[PDB]
Design a protein around this nucleic acid. Structure first.
Lengths: 424, 110, 424, 380, 424
DNA sequence: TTTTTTTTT
DNA sequence: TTTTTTTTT
């Protein structure tokens, strides 16, 4: 039996009776002759016909078009159109359905055209050059059928480009999300908004660990939302040593060393004070499963009050899925639940996609870089990259740059090596 | 439960089929049951700031209370106040510095 | 059928009636409930019971204990104890038998305990955390059963250590074996004693070939025993060129070169004289089998008079056994026959375990080194290692050190590069 | 119960033996390998035997009965009953070496007939590998028979005295092969018969120059006939090279050239220039030659090219050796001196660019004369 | 059934009645007992017998010998000899036939001798050393049977060598083939003769491409024969740029650059003139099959007039035969058709066997070098190698040497780097 | 293996 | 291949 998909096919028509916008998209991919069941042929034919006449797409009108043709009792009456309206899963995916229809339609041709070649292979056995030629032509003809040609004209890109730069300059406003004590970003972010799968990525030198912490951190001090930190690589207290140095302005080296002064003891004794009243919730578990990240984020919201979730680099999360080298897919499965999680707890799941191997080895950022990491870019409502380069003159620091490469509806920080912090 | 019973049964049918790998089997028999059960943390007994305060005290006074294991080298005796119980210690080095010298050392003064 | 070994089991009991020392060892490894046959249970139970009461272990006493219990006609009467006394191969290996009993006993448990888990797997399906926990506990319980715990206390090591150093200093005496013209070693060796599998090992630079030769050599000159030399790598006359240079004090280079003087011709003409009356028996066959080494050593003893056997590095002997990379085992099979051969010809089979690859590559000795070579250390009644390091001032020589790492009931030589010899 | 070669009884003894005195094993093990035994039960039992050995456990009726039953072949190896049988069988254990010895023999004869039969069934099944087959047919029978030394004729001091004389007087008695270079003529007094000679070197020193050299002074001044096998050049380049050195275009060339040609024309040299060669043809032809014209020498131009083994699975050591050895062998068979040429490169270039006797496996395989530079002889 | 080949066997005899020279060769390889069919035994026996008596080999005489013996009605009468004369494919290959006879004869023995060993394997089971010995002897005996011993005596080589040098000096003459505007070679070649598979080989640095072109070239200018050039690696006009620089004496660099003068424009405008009236026929097809080279060479001869064929390095020709790494054979199949093609168009198929990998890598020529490339040496009636080495003083050039290593019945050129040409 | 690759921080 | 990996200095 020829490739076909009634189940998909009938799902398409139904999509149209569930919402006219359906037809528009549909007509983009198929043509009446693409459907397999004759009935569906006429019914589509009918439909696009009425949509042309100005008549909006709907049950009645087509019933009309159809009847008009002497085709109703043919395609099974409205009764089936009723059914039709029922046959779809959800119009919002009407594209796919149609595609699937298109494919089963195209393969038909790869087969019919081919089969016809074989029949001719045996018949005209009296001029083969010709035979070969059209055998080439024909086949190519099969490929050039998928209603392709989606060239994004330059006019559409520019308008988009200029509209992006205007919002850029119009972005003077009042935060409506979790305030990020970083005026520059803050002016961009407009507040780390809730339900947003937040991803920030970069190269080694741990430059990232510091930035997330410092966020969750400055977030725990000022905002009154509770924050969660998933530093798999970094331990409970290891992390806290990093923010204690940061909030108190202590030379942690001076501290790890225990080489602390009496004023340093202060700053030290002081940083703690800050967090005491803070709301920081860590978890340094070796490597957990997305299934657990959920149980603990979700449970807290219901217990105390969830606001942020900073997981220290996703790559190191264990994927319950199927093993042995399908990380492209593995990450695809977990990074996708995170996006599903930015939704449930109505909070921003900021994640830091970082690296070691490929980024460090590329010694001598943008989208294609994390795309290698795969489909995180799609789930993410916001993707940001950290970029910093490596005078002998003092007043020692290093200006790091924030290059946010994406944001659904949408910087620079100086870094401090002595306390591993960040300043505006 | 299914995979639980499945592994257990593995050992079973195994015991009979390898009458000459007793040391081995036992070690992998443990292995097998262990591999069906692990997920999250446990322990024996039924905030980090605190832990970081308790830590700071130890860094400050250089004191202690009810315990004792003298490295025999105040240097270390100072940076631990005793080789705490249930702790895993490690001393890495390159050949001929006395990795073993040291080892015997401690255990010697201990 | 549950793991069990009557054949082994009954061999154990019998071992005890063949010698009470048996029971001691046995009780170390098993417990009555370890035996499979009920009969053997009671009989062991009985036995250790009487051994406790002071009553020495033997046939009668247990017959007693047993009867006393109302158990004789049960365990098959003395008739079986008679049998029992018969069932063993040789008490001296009573350990093994018992072990084997222990194992078959332990696996029983790995199986019983496991089987019980499965039954519970299906039954209590109402609290699994608990289930898993005890499933962990139980299993571990199976491993901690082999009556282990053989910690060599420091007191026992020290006494041994001090007793080793006293014999060290009390070793002033008269040789009772083949005299080795090397007073230092000689003072240690007390004479290369007969029936001793003698192994001396080291690194490249052929430093060994010289030392064995010089032994067999100084052994052929002074002692009146006949000596055999198996230099597979070195040829008939090649070897003799090395001792001729050694006994005459000739600059063999001067000799290979033929650059000999009239006084040198003398030494030359002289060294030979020495050996003429000597008794040196070489064989430089490419690589022979242990089966041949035997036929020629054995045949000589019966023909002329065997005393020593210096085989130039064992590694190069061909193992009749099974091929393609089981040298660990290969050597294990041949090195083991050599030890069997130190026994038959009542002579010392001195061998030089040497090397090229692993020793030279370790540029920048002790037991673990030859242990890699495998179980030569066990067969050897004596293992010795040669250790030498590599001023511009003349009076040219190099002090080599002899580090004997082992000896059943138990040095330094200066080396001479000009004549490839050894001096006290 | 079937009939080819087999002494079941002997085997039973050997097994039995081990059982009676563990020592039996270790002695038997010096002569037999599991495979040796005729049938399955035994085969594996001796194995078990051998197995418990390695473990380090003492072999005896238990550990064997245990191991055997441990490797689940007990009930069908005979079970304990048959086991005990072989056991109670032997009365003592100090003759075992005898029975063992027979068992082996049977093993030989069986495997002897087995190989022979291989060729057989082969001859028919490979009507298109005649050269090959013959060469491996030899191979196969040879591989069943070798162990210790042989020869033709029915103390080393002596040999080292006879050697010293040769080193002293620099004399000789009844023999002769003039290297044509007293240097060598002095360090040999003649390239002795049945000797395998080797001259190793790096590219462009004249490995081939030399080769032709000797054979040149040998066929010109002596009645001996030298044959040369060249693998990288044609009979011309050689002979050209020959009268080229024999003559040391202008008229002085014409005259000096004719003089050389006449002299070397009368000379008896024999060449062969074939792509690659087999040591076996070399001998094939050289045996016939020595019977048709008789000759006293043979020069080979670098053997690495003598791909003659057959299977081709070996390094620079195995096929090179099989050749080297086959060479010596050849020499001994012909009673003449075989001089080959070989090459080194990476080692010497390694040192000489930045600013040996090991780098020649063939010589390590079996030559009794290596030369750079001599390094082996049965100084510079 | 024993190896045998009647079909081959009877082909042999017949070869003899087709030409007495046959017998000579035959007797070289076989002996009457080598043939399998008895009949053929006597018939050969007979034959060589009469050839000995002086009586020439032929039908009648043997019929005689045969009858004389009382053997005719035995071997099937002349009737079969008649047949015999018929049974061969072509005497000229009589060797092979015989060989094949020899082999089937030899294997018989490898089998008979072996089989006899097995029978004795079971019989004399009373002295095996002996058995093994003769089992060695016997087998070797089988190998030493192929009537080998083809030692090319030095006398035969020398005469050949002196006859080669005399023709060398007697080669003063008038060309009778296609004149090659290269007096030196020309004096050797005596004119690139027709029906000759002409091969010239060498190392990289394209030193060859220039030499072939310059030939075909100087051949197209002076001779009036038409020339074909198959530069697979080099393109249509790419090639012509190389000869235009050559015939006009232009600094092609000056030309590629377009940096041409007014006098240069001349030479430029001039070189073309030359070829305008020339007859050069190129084809730079990517890689063609020998099947096409034929259709185009052959078709031209019939259309305009074929004379030469210079294919720019054979290695790069596509072999229709069977794939994936049997180039030794691949080339063997095509290089062999070329030789077949030097024959059909009665012209010289000059080819340039060149290289990249093995020749360049051999940094620090003769027959063994191309022999690696395989059996081109046999098909080629003429093989030539180009050899050139690599003062700061001007009058800039480089003397290349021509070392022709072969020629059925049988130099130096200075090179020019500025115009990529060749001069006498 | 009667349209199909059921484990190993 | 109806409880099982029978060569290659």
């Amino acid at each position: 039996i020829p490739p076909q998909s009634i189940e998909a096919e009938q799902a398409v028509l139904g999509a149209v009776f569930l919402d006219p916008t359906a037809l528009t998209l549909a007509s983009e991919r198929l043509i009446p002759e693409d459907f397999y069941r004759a009935a569906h042929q006429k019914i589509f034919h009918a439909m696009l016909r009425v949509a042309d006449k100005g008549e909006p797409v709907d049950l009645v009108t087509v019933t009309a078009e159809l009847a008009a043709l002497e085709q109703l009792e043919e395609v099974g009456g409205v009764s089936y159109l009723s059914e039709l309206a029922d046959s779809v899963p959800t119009a919002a995916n009407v594209e796919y359905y149609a595609r699937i229809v298109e494919e089963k339609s195209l393969l038909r041709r790869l087969i019919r055209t081919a089969t016809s070649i074989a029949q001719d292979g045996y018949t005209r056995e009296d001029e083969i050059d010709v035979l070969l030629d059209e055998a080439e032509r024909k086949i190519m003809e099969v490929s050039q059928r998928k209603h392709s040609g989606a060239f994004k004209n330059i006019k559409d890109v520019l308008v988009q480009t200029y509209d992006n730069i205007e919002m850029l300059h119009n972005r003077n406003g009042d935060i409506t999300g979790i305030p990020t004590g970083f005026t520059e970003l803050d002016r961009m972010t407009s507040g780390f908004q809730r339900s947003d799968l937040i991803i920030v990525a970069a190269r080694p030198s741990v430059g990232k660990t510091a930035f997330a912490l410092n966020i969750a951190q400055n977030v725990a001090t000022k905002t009154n939302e509770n924050v969660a930190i998933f530093s798999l690589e970094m331990s409970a207290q290891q992390l806290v040593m990093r923010m204690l140095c940061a909030e108190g302005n202590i030379n942690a080296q001076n501290l790890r060393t225990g080489k602390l002064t009496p004023e340093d003891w202060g700053k030290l004794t002081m940083a703690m004070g800050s967090l005491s009243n803070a709301g920081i919730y860590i978890d340094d578990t070796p490597s957990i499963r997305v299934s657990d990240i959920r149980a603990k984020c979700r449970r807290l919201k219901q217990e105390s009050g969830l606001g942020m979730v900073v997981i220290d680099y996703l790559q190191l999360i264990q994927g319950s899925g199927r093993n042995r080298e399908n990380r492209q897919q593995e990450v695809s499965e977990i990074s996708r639940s995170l996006k599903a999680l930015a939704r449930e707890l109505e909070v921003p799941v900021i994640a830091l996609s970082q690296l070691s191997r490929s980024v460090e080895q590329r010694q001598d950022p943008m989208m294609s870089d994390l795309r290698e990491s795969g489909s995180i870019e799609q789930d993410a409502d916001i993707v940001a990259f950290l970029y910093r380069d490596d005078n002998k003159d003092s007043e020692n620091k290093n200006i790091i740059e924030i290059i946010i490469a994406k944001q659904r509806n949408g910087v620079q920080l100086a870094f401090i090596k002595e306390y591993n912090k960040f300043v505006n």
